[PDB]
Amino acid sequence: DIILTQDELSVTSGESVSISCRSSKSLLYKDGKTYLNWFLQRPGQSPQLLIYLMSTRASGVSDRFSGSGSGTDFTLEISRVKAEDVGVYYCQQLVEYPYTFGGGTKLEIK
């Protein structure tokens, strides 16, 4: 199984932050696409999609969020952190069965 590694814990409102996700294996598929997703789970809510195919922002997601990566290292960049961004950020891969998630990174504002 592909292992995705995230720090358990990650800031002031308006600062920028990034979330790291490290994969045990390349997530590039033979079609040239990288099947890596980012979700935010706000406190006591269901997860919501932010990014798919490593760097595509989902419809309705703020352009404050962007995704990048290279090899086995992936990054979610958040410009201008807001109260609504508080929660747990999960990465996930869909390139191999079984689909697997990172352990989640908690973001809090001080």
Binding site: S46, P47, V88, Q92, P98, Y99
Partner: protein, 122 residues
Amino acid sequence: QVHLQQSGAELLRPGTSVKMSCKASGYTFTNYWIGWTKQRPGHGLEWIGDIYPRSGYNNYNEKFKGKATLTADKSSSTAYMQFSSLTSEDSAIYYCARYYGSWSYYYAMDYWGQGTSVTVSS
């Protein structure tokens, strides 16, 4: 608006079965994959399995192949997940969600249900 409405909390004894529902509205149910996720405290998110409601094609995380059964009723736009042989390790919130994409490819769970809480106790 797109909505996945999941059934209410269950409190069940070990060795029993549960069948939970996920009723889709606000999109064409038979045009998108549905998948299920497990969330327990200390264990983040885990993928259980996917179903393509139009065809009934379902596939599983090997570790749930014994335990989970996915079905879909096209006439009511409802997906179901049945768990047999419940144990305390099955105590979790279970999500259903639709995937962005199509039939031959999909990328990510884009709309999520609110979660069904299952608690297994003796």
